[PDB]
Design an enzyme around this catalytic site. Structure first.
Site, PDB file in Angstrom:
ATOM      1  CG  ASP A   7      -1.863   1.324   1.269  1.00  8.80           C
ATOM      2  OD1 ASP A   7      -2.644   1.578   0.335  1.00  8.80           O
ATOM      3  OD2 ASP A   7      -1.905   1.997   2.324  1.00  8.80           O
ATOM      4  CB  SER A   8       0.138   4.712  -0.887  1.00  5.26           C
ATOM      5  OG  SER A   8      -1.008   5.089  -0.104  1.00  5.26           O
ATOM      6  CD  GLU A 150      -3.388  10.153   5.396  1.00  2.51           C
ATOM      7  OE1 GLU A 150      -3.100  11.351   5.121  1.00  2.51           O
ATOM      8  OE2 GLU A 150      -2.957   9.065   4.801  1.00  2.51           O
ATOM      9  CG  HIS A 183      -7.431   6.592   4.095  1.00  2.27           C
ATOM     10  ND1 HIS A 183      -6.570   5.782   3.375  1.00  2.27           N
ATOM     11  CD2 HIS A 183      -6.643   7.518   4.702  1.00  2.27           C
ATOM     12  CE1 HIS A 183      -5.320   6.168   3.590  1.00  2.27           C
ATOM     13  NE2 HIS A 183      -5.342   7.222   4.372  1.00  2.27           N
TER      14      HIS A 183
HETATM   15  C1  LIG Z   1      -7.951   0.431  10.037  1.00  4.48           C
HETATM   16  C2  LIG Z   1      -8.582  -0.268  11.172  1.00  4.48           C
HETATM   17  C3  LIG Z   1      -8.036  -1.669  10.900  1.00  4.48           C
HETATM   18  C4  LIG Z   1      -7.972   0.156  12.513  1.00  4.48           C
HETATM   19  N1  LIG Z   1      -8.157   1.579  12.868  1.00  4.48           N
HETATM   20  C5  LIG Z   1      -9.301   2.023  13.423  1.00  4.48           C
HETATM   21  O1  LIG Z   1     -10.177   1.188  13.532  1.00  4.48           O
HETATM   22  N2  LIG Z   1      -9.526   3.313  13.806  1.00  4.48           N
HETATM   23  C6  LIG Z   1     -10.853   3.707  14.413  1.00  4.48           C
HETATM   24  C7  LIG Z   1      -8.565   4.243  13.701  1.00  4.48           C
HETATM   25  O2  LIG Z   1      -8.798   5.436  13.997  1.00  4.48           O
HETATM   26  C8  LIG Z   1      -7.250   3.800  13.104  1.00  4.48           C
HETATM   27  C9  LIG Z   1      -6.058   4.408  12.836  1.00  4.48           C
HETATM   28  C10 LIG Z   1      -5.641   5.802  13.009  1.00  4.48           C
HETATM   29  C11 LIG Z   1      -4.577   6.230  13.789  1.00  4.48           C
HETATM   30  N3  LIG Z   1      -4.522   7.563  13.604  1.00  4.48           N
HETATM   31  C12 LIG Z   1      -5.439   7.945  12.716  1.00  4.48           C
HETATM   32  N4  LIG Z   1      -6.189   6.897  12.355  1.00  4.48           N
HETATM   33  C13 LIG Z   1      -7.298   6.868  11.388  1.00  4.48           C
HETATM   34  N5  LIG Z   1      -5.219   3.499  12.287  1.00  4.48           N
HETATM   35  C14 LIG Z   1      -3.923   3.858  11.748  1.00  4.48           C
HETATM   36  C15 LIG Z   1      -4.310   4.675  10.486  1.00  4.48           C
HETATM   37  C16 LIG Z   1      -3.859   5.937  10.341  1.00  4.48           C
HETATM   38  C17 LIG Z   1      -4.170   6.779   9.255  1.00  4.48           C
HETATM   39  C18 LIG Z   1      -4.976   6.345   8.211  1.00  4.48           C
HETATM   40  C19 LIG Z   1      -5.494   5.057   8.298  1.00  4.48           C
HETATM   41  C20 LIG Z   1      -6.324   4.601   7.294  1.00  4.48           C
HETATM   42  C21 LIG Z   1      -6.866   3.348   7.311  1.00  4.48           C
HETATM   43  C22 LIG Z   1      -6.540   2.494   8.369  1.00  4.48           C
HETATM   44  C23 LIG Z   1      -5.721   2.942   9.376  1.00  4.48           C
HETATM   45  C24 LIG Z   1      -5.167   4.215   9.413  1.00  4.48           C
HETATM   46  N6  LIG Z   1      -5.897   2.305  12.150  1.00  4.48           N
HETATM   47  C25 LIG Z   1      -7.094   2.463  12.662  1.00  4.48           C
HETATM   48  N1  LIG Z   2      -4.411   3.979  -0.335  1.00  2.00           N
HETATM   49  C1  LIG Z   2      -5.053   5.038  -1.162  1.00  2.00           C
HETATM   50  C2  LIG Z   2      -5.395   6.209  -0.292  1.00  2.00           C
HETATM   51  C3  LIG Z   2      -4.147   6.978   0.178  1.00  2.00           C
HETATM   52  C4  LIG Z   2      -3.438   7.550  -1.034  1.00  2.00           C
HETATM   53  O1  LIG Z   2      -4.044   8.380  -1.783  1.00  2.00           O
HETATM   54  O2  LIG Z   2      -2.280   7.099  -1.271  1.00  2.00           O
HETATM   55  C5  LIG Z   2      -6.229   4.425  -1.880  1.00  2.00           C
HETATM   56  O3  LIG Z   2      -6.685   3.371  -1.406  1.00  2.00           O
HETATM   57  O4  LIG Z   2      -6.758   4.974  -2.877  1.00  2.00           O
END
Ligand SMILES: CC(C)Cn1c(=O)n(C)c(=O)c2c(-c3cncn3C)n(Cc3cccc4ccccc34)nc21
Ligand SMILES: N[C@H](CCC(=O)O)C(=O)O
Ligand SMILES: CC(C)Cn1c(=O)n(C)c(=O)c2c(-c3cncn3C)n(Cc3cccc4ccccc34)nc21
Ligand SMILES: N[C@H](CCC(=O)O)C(=O)O
Lengths: 255, 255
Positions: A7-8, A150, A183
Site C-alpha cells: 500500500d501507499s 488521517e 481509508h
Molecule cells: C484500520 C482499522 C483496521 C484500525 N483503525 C481504526 O479502527 N480506527 C478507528 C482508527 O482510527 C485507526 C487508525 C488511526 C490512527 N490515527 C489515525 N487513524 C485513522 N489506524 C492507523 C491509520 C492511520 C491513518 C490512516 C489510516 C487509514 C486506514 C486504516 C488505518 C489508518 N488504524 C485504525
Molecule cells: N491507499 C489510497 C489512499 C491513500 C493515497 O491516496 O495514497 C487508496 O486506497 O486509494
C-alpha cells in the site's frame, strides 16, 4: 502461503485486517510506501512507476502472491506491475466487481463509486462495472476524506460538513456505494448515517468494503481457507518511518 | 545571478511570487518534489533525505544560491543541506524570525505559529523566537489547511469549520500570526477574519508571510537592490505532474 501486501502507507491496514481475521495466510510481508503517500493526488505515470518500484522491494522476500491493498495503485499500476511479475498480483477493484455481481442482481441499481481523484479519473471501477452489465453508474472523488481520516476526524461537524460538501451536489441517490479507497471504511457508518439522515430510506445504501471483497476472491480463486495458523508471522516495512508503522500495527491490529 | 528554489511541490509559488515581484534574480530554477508531496505529514529522517536529494537535482544547473521555499523542509532538512552544500542555502524560518524581531519590540506580544505537523513538531520557530528573547509563543499544527487549499477550499463553510476546529481551543489572543507554511498565504485574509470576527481584537494581528520575509532578508544580507532584469528566465521542474506544474506557472504567475 507467504504473500506480500503493498500500500501507499498505513491505509492498507483496512485490507490487512480483513485478511488477518479470515486467517488466510501463514506469513505476510506488508510494505507501505509511506515516504510518498498519498498516491491519490498524483498522475498516472508517477503512480505506475511507484508500483513497479514496490515490485523490487518484494523480490528478496520470495512471496508467492502480491496483494495491492491500495485502490489508487490498483486502478493505475496493476497492469504494469503484472506485466513484469511472475507471481500473481491481486488488486482491490476486480474483487469488488465480483462482490457486486453476487450482491446486486438489479443491473439498474444506482451505484456510486467513491475514491481518490486518481482512482476516479481512471474510471477503472465504471469500466469494469459496465462490462458486467451495469447501467446506472455514478462516481465521485471525495479527496478530502483521506486527510480528514488521517487526522482522526471520524465524526462531528467537520466530517459532517465535508460529507455534505461532496454529497449535496449528487443528483442520484445511490442504492450501492463502493468504498473505493483504503481509508473510507473508517467512516462507513457516518456515510450510512449521512444518507439515512438526509433522505427518507428504510435501509442505508449497501456499502462495498474492498477488504471483505478481496477476502472472498482469494478464498474462491486460491481455495484459501480460514485455517492458516492462529499466530501468522507479519513483518512491516516502509519507505518513511517504519517504527511508527509498527507502532500503529501494535495498537490497531494487535501485532 | 542564477538561483534555485526548492519546495515539496507547487506551494512554493507563494514564495516565488514574492521573489519575482522584488526583481532580485535574473534566472530562477524552480524544483518541486511533487511525486512525494506533502512533506508536512512526515518525519525528520525522511524529510532530511528529501532535502539532500534536492541538492543532487540542482548540481547540473550551476546555481549560486538555493532558496528552500518549503517551511517543512526549512524546519527539518536545512542544517543537513547546509552541512553538505558548497553554495549558500536560505530557508524561510530564519527570515521570518528576523522580520518579527524588526516589527515587534514587545517581547511579551502573543505570537502564534501555524505550520504543518512536522514544522510545528520540530519547534524550529519556537526555538528561534525564544533565542531572540520572546516570552509568549503558541503553536498550532493546522494540518488540514494544506489539502483544503490544494482543493481550492479558499472560502465558505468547510474552511470556516476547519478554522473553527483548529482555532477554538486557543487560550491566547495573538497579536502576531506566522503563516508558517507555503500554502497559508492563500487564506491569510480568512484567518485574519476568523480572529477579528470571533474575538474582541482591537486591530488585526500582524501576519508574517514567509515570502515577503525572505525577500527582506535577501535584500539586506546579500545587498540585493531590486534591479534584476525586467523578465527573468524561470524554469519549472518536478518529480511528477511537471506539465501540470508548468500550466500552473503560466496561469497564476504570468510566466
Ligand atoms: C484500520 C482499522 C483496521 C484500525 N483503525 C481504526 O479502527 N480506527 C478507528 C482508527 O482510527 C485507526 C487508525 C488511526 C490512527 N490515527 C489515525 N487513524 C485513522 N489506524 C492507523 C491509520 C492511520 C491513518 C490512516 C489510516 C487509514 C486506514 C486504516 C488505518 C489508518 N488504524 C485504525
Ligand atoms: N491507499 C489510497 C489512499 C491513500 C493515497 O491516496 O495514497 C487508496 O486506497 O486509494
Ligand atoms: C502565487 C499563488 C498565490 C497564485 N495562486 C492564487 O492566488 N490562487 C488564488 C490560487 O488559487 C492558486 C493556485 C491553485 C490552483 N489550484 C488550487 N490552488 C490553490 N495555485 C497553484 C497552487 C496549487 C495548490 C496549492 C498551492 C499552494 C500555494 C501556492 C499555490 C498553490 N496558485 C495560485
Ligand atoms: N510546502 C510545505 C507544505 C506542503 C507540504 O506539506 O509539503 C510547507 O511549507 O510546510
Amino acid at each position: 502461503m507467504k504473500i506480500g501486501v503493498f500500500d501507499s502507507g498505513v491505509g492498507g491496514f483496512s485490507v490487512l485486517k480483513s485478511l488477518l481475521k479470515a486467517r488466510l495466510f501463514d506469513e505476510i510481508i506488508y510494505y507501505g510506501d509511506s515516504a510518498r503517500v498519498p498516491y491519490g493526488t498524483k498522475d498516472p505515470t508517477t503512480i505506475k512507476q511507484f508500483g513497479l518500484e514496490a515490485l523490487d522491494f518484494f523480490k528478496p522476500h520470495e512471496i508467492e502472491l502480491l496483494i495491492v491493498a491500495c485502490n489508487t495503485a490498483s486502478a493505475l499500476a496493476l497492469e504494469e506491475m503484472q506485466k513484469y511479475s511472475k507471481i500473481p498480483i491481486v488488486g482491490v477493484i476486480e474483487p469488488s466487481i465480483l462482490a457486486i455481481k453476487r450482491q446486486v442482481e438489479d443491473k439498474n441499481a444506482p451505484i456510486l463509486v467513491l475514491g481518490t481523484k486518481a482512482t476516479i479519473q481512471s474510471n477503472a471501477y465504471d469500466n469494469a462495472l459496465k462490462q458486467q452489465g451495469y447501467l446506472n453508474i455514478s462516481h465521485l472523488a471525495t479527496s478530502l476524506f483521506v486527510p480528514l481520516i488521517e487526522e482522526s476526524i471520524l465524526e462531528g461537524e467537520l466530517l459532517e460538513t465535508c460529507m455534505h460538501y461532496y454529497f449535496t451536489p449528487l443528483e442520484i441517490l445511490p442504492e450501492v456505494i463502493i468504498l473505493g479507497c483504503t481509508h473510507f471504511p473508517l467512516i462507513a457508518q457516518k456515510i450510512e448515517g449521512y444518507f439515512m439522515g438526509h433522505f427518507a430510506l428504510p435501509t442505508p445504501p449497501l456499502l462495498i468494503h474492498s477488504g471483505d471483497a478481496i477476502v472472498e476472491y482469494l478464498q474462491q480463486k486460491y481455495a484459501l481457507k480460514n485455517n492458516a495458523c492462529t499466530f501468522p508471522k507479519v513483518e512491516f516495512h516502509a519507505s518513511g518511518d517504519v517504527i511508527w508503522l509498527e507502532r500503529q500495527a501494535k495498537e490497531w491490529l494487535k501485532l
